[PDB]
Ligand binder design. Structure first.
Ligand SMILES: [Cl-]
Lengths: 669, 651
């Protein structure tokens, strides 16, 4: 059963599943068929029966629209993806969505579709493998050794994020990363040369990559040999595979309408004749299956690694335990107590610091407790305060390929690439990564935060300099809409702590839960608040009563809802409001997302139905309408900022006791 | 003796370190590092008139590295722009003309607003593209009126950002040879020595883009930088010039430099060596005379150039906009609002010669092109572009969006560019900066919800419409049909806020409108179907946008059969609706009549109109991969769910 027959198999499933769904992208799976045979048949180290096998090569389909390529490969090689599913391509609840989705389909390593990000994910996975290896291998016993393969097309290469990820990968000498490029002269608008005339080999050599240019992308033997050559490189490798889009189509190969549209029944019948593929839709003859199936080889590969690991466990019982725990993403055994100790510690200290500082202090405590902690900053380490006393900066080896182990990464000025890479580090397993930048620059990395939320993986994204409180850098740096815009992304937890204790709570919560988190810290100092034991336990509920009414008040009730640096203002507002006949309960809402997940009883306790509310936050006001209603009030900022000291701006922009009072009287009128 | 270049440069170092000391805030190192580059460019090559920063044929300068803003302030102050020393003393103070990062519109001679890295460079690319397009369009064999360079100062941060890749790759494919980038190659970014995280061979990278690179220029040798700029001007390719560059410390720097003068004191001869008013006036005078000769030979073109450089619409615009809108209403067509968008683009292009469209590799999907357009293309043999009015930007959303900002700043075109709505997350900060700059950039977004169907949750926007509404001063439109599309487009084109125009993949039903309703569409929110004149049924308001307006209209008779009388408010733009006066807003949404919002995106946004007691038919999860009709039923976009919600709200 020839490789033509094996490649053609991919062609038939891709074209027939697209036609069936009358939707999707047949051109790339047909263009890349032989590349598929080359990598998957002759090189990929994997086990269909266990797609969670720790030491498997990681494959990433960065050009995610060509998803039938992956579904064919998963199906053909014997993963648990039955033919029924490929028949249900692009149908509700199928295991075959239009773009591949992590957690939905076995063997799907990450979620792609937004261009460029799969490639950045793959850099993160290569970084994970390289870091773990440096960490867990011993001169007399290796348990970490796998490559990271990524398919990509012209789209990914035009996206800025390819630049960020490949520059970093080159500087970090990630030589087990191997990229195969669907080099076909085509993107969606037509002939790529009219908008994209890069000398791509030259670009990639400039990054410190090895490039294998001009491979015949329809020659299984040629691609195979190029991968072998890549596999022996001192540098990450780009393989340039010259292909024809929809190659094998009877009449439409190389056309500009095979990217994202069905071929039609007529072209499909004629393609069956030209290829000699005699089988009906979704019929695959057993000799194609026998040539593609990897269950046997997979079993052998993984059983071998198990023996390899068992021998490792004998010589290093403690490290083997740690590896298994970390690969599984399980926290230490004494977690609740150590986490409660970090929080108690902050509460005991009672210091008024910037929550960026509170953050660094929490990281100190997390690190002493989580060897898996992997920090980093997008060239703002000194500003974000993401590194800690005992941390080691990850660096490429001076002389050979690979990295020296470390646990804080300087990502460079690459917020988007850092964020996608973090998603890769997380998906790889073995570390608990986070990475920082200024809050406003969440606008550069936004879709990566989004993709973490879609995948439901606990990526942590740290943002500092969160408002006009940052002062003089001015309105291009001063976030106004950002905090609310991140809340709005489904499944993304947003924390904006008021003090050292809310920071400690936010971090330990984030490290321990399944949602990706944005942790949002201030530049400037925020007053410490004191809390009851009951209150300390309620911070983890996202919103809690920081200060209640006294039974002895018997004046007009209001609820002040505040977050982050504005908790101080709500708190300073209480007595002045009392002296005006208003009794103010202060609710601190460090995470509205976590608060919204609470039960109805708890939410009613904190925000009693029918008591009016004023929300206080140095951000856009409309967001708070969900808690304060049409009749409630908001003290916030609905314009861009200005360049001036923080104290000047806070006054200028009406974050004053006087404004809080004025608003409260207006709400209660 | 007249000022040496060393004294000319040290004047910059003095102002930078003194302004920073005065403000006790900011970064003196970058301006001080780039001072010689400043002298070489501004004093020897920059063509500009300090007395008129709006001279149409001026060279364009961009400080892409926003941190060294005292470099620019020094340069503007020294060469004679209207930026007094009292302002430099007021660095980083409230309402000064010397903000922390430079701001377009605040300070004369500031061409764009920079701060987030890489975007200035993308801005510059869009300005160079503007100059090349105008020239190809307007210059004649016997009379040239367009001819200027675009210069950008650049640092390591800018080069690491993915947006430099998008912008520089495009500039190199388009052979924008009048773009000249000068790179502060100092070995340093904020975290320390760049080599640990940025070890690019930047020269080879840029040659791979089709740029000319002059590597290894001594960043402190004015003559060397000068000659390097001179060479770049002879190049057939855009050029990158790689320039290798409190109290006690300031006092000792003064001594090390032999700068004897007190803070903010510039000696007369340094002023005289930097002043550019006299060369400026001559340059602009020469140009005004070359323009008079152009006007004598090409009077219609000359008036069109002037109108378009001011960004003024045609004098009978109100009639021409009304004809576009009326033709939409007359046609009564049920199509996707992406198709409605293309139809309006077509009518706009026939009356706006300045119209300049494009798409980030989604031309067919977004429908941004029109039948009479010409595609912008590099010249086959020489540098530069053949003129066109539709640009294939490649798969570069952020770079396209920042380039558009630069095209808008340059003057002469009315540009817009398209991509899918979710991919607004890639270009977001450029949307933000347009809104901060107050410039009428037009961003087109299509495929706006689960209505796109099978492509699935990575493409299906859910939070995007509401998250863009949050951005101050950015107008968001999500028209229900061809008439709301024509209104949104003609309003966006005519007004000063940047606009996001949000279009559906799928067919949306046309809605008939009375005259009074047609006149209210441009108010952003309006009554599309009102309650009967005297009724006994309980009242609800349905507020809907986009594709959901059809769902609101379909719910009205079913609601009436349940004893519920529904007003349908269409809200194509909540942002424009919020700028309406209190009387109008109360007329559309009367106090104390309860509301249900309907919109295929996050629900929380609507709480500002429907309150805690109101209702929302929306989606607060990600989508799924399935046909659009299957998804809409799956996600509860149904009359039955509208009725349930309305009854629960009315309870
Ligand atoms: Cl592709």
């Amino acid at each position: 059963a020839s490789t033509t027959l094996m490649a053609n198999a991919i062609r038939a499933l891709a074209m027939d599943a697209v036609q069936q769904a009358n939707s999707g992208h047949p051109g790339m799976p047909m263009g890349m068929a032989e590349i598929g045979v080359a990598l998957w048949s002759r090189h990929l180290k994997h086990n269909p029966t266990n797609p969670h096998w720790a030491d498997r090569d990681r494959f990433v389909l960065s050009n995610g629209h060509g998803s039938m390529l992956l579904y064919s490969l998963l199906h053909l090689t014997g993963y648990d993806l039955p033919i029924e599913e490929l028949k249900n391509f692009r149908q509700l609840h199928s295991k075959t969505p239009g773009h591949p989705e992590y957690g939905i389909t076995p063997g799907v390593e990450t979620t792609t579709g937004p261009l460029g990000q799969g490639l950045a994910n793959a850099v993160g996975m290569a970084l994970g493998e390289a870091l773990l290896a440096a960490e867990f291998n011993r001169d007399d016993a290796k348990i970490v050794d796998h490559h990271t393969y990524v398919f990509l097309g012209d789209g990914c290469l035009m996206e800025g994020i390819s630049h960020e990820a490949c520059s970093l990968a080159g500087t970090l000498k990630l030589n087990k990363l191997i990229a195969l490029y669907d080099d076909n002269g085509i993107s969606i608008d037509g002939d790529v040369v009219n908008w994209f005339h890069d000398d791509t080999p030259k670009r990639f050599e400039a990054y410190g990559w090895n490039v294998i240019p001009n491979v015949n992308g329809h020659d299984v033997d040629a691609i195979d040999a190029a991968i072998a050559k890549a596999k022996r490189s001192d540098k990450p490798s780009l393989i340039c595979c010259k292909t024809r889009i929809g190659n094998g189509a009877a009449t439409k190969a190389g056309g500009h309408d095979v990217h994202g549209a069905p071929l039609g029944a007529d072209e499909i019948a004629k393609t069956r004749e030209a290829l000699g593929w005699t089988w009906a839709p979704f019929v695959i003859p057993q000799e194609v299956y026998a040539a593609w199936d990897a269950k046997e080889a997979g079993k052998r590969s993984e059983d071998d690694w198990n023996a390899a690991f068992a021998q490792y466990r004998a010589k290093y019982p403690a490290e083997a335990a740690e590896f298994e725990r970390r690969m599984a993403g399980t926290l230490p055994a004494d977690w609740a107590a150590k986490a409660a100790a970090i929080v108690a510690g902050a509460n005991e200290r009672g210091e008024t610091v910037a929550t960026r500082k509170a953050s660094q202090q929490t990281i100190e405590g997390l690190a002493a407790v989580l060897p898996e902690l992997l920090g980093g900053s997008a060239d703002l380490t000194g500003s974000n305060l993401t590194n800690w006393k005992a941390s080691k900066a990850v660096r490429a080896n001076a002389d050979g390929p690979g990295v020296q182990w470390g646990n804080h990464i300087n990502y460079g000025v690459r917020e988007f690439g850092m964020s996608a890479a973090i998603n890769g580090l997380v998906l790889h397993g073995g570390y608990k990564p986070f990475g920082g930048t200024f809050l406003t620059f969440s606008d550069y990395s936004r879709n990566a935060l989004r993709v973490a939320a879609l995948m439901k993986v606990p990526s942590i994204f740290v943002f500092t300099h969160d408002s006009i409180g940052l002062g003089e850098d001015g309105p291009t740096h001063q976030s106004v809409e950002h905090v609310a815009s991140l809340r709005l992304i489904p499944n993304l937890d947003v924390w904006r702590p008021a003090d050292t204790v809310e920071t400690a709570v936010a971090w330990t919560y984030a490290v321990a839960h399944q949602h990706p988190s944005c942790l949002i810290f201030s530049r400037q100092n925020l007053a410490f608040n004191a809390r009851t034991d009951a209150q300390l336990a309620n911070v983890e509920k996202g919103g809690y009563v920081l200060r209640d009414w006294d039974e002895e008040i018997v004046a007009r009730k209001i609820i002040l809802i505040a977050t982050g640096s504005e908790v101080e203002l709500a708190m300073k507002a209480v007595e002045p409001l009392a002296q005006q006949g208003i009794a103010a309960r202060v609710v601190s809402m460090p995470s509205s997302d976590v608060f919204d997940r609470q039960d109805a009883e708890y939410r009613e306790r904190v925000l009693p139905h029918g008591v009016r509310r004023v929300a206080i936050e140095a951000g856009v006001t409309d967001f708070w309408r969900k808690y304060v209603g049409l009749e409630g009030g908001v003290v916030g900022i609905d314009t861009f900022g200005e360049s001036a000291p923080a104290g000047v701006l806070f006054k200028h922009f009406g974050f004053t006791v006087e404004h809080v009072i004025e608003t409260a009287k207006a709400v209660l009128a």
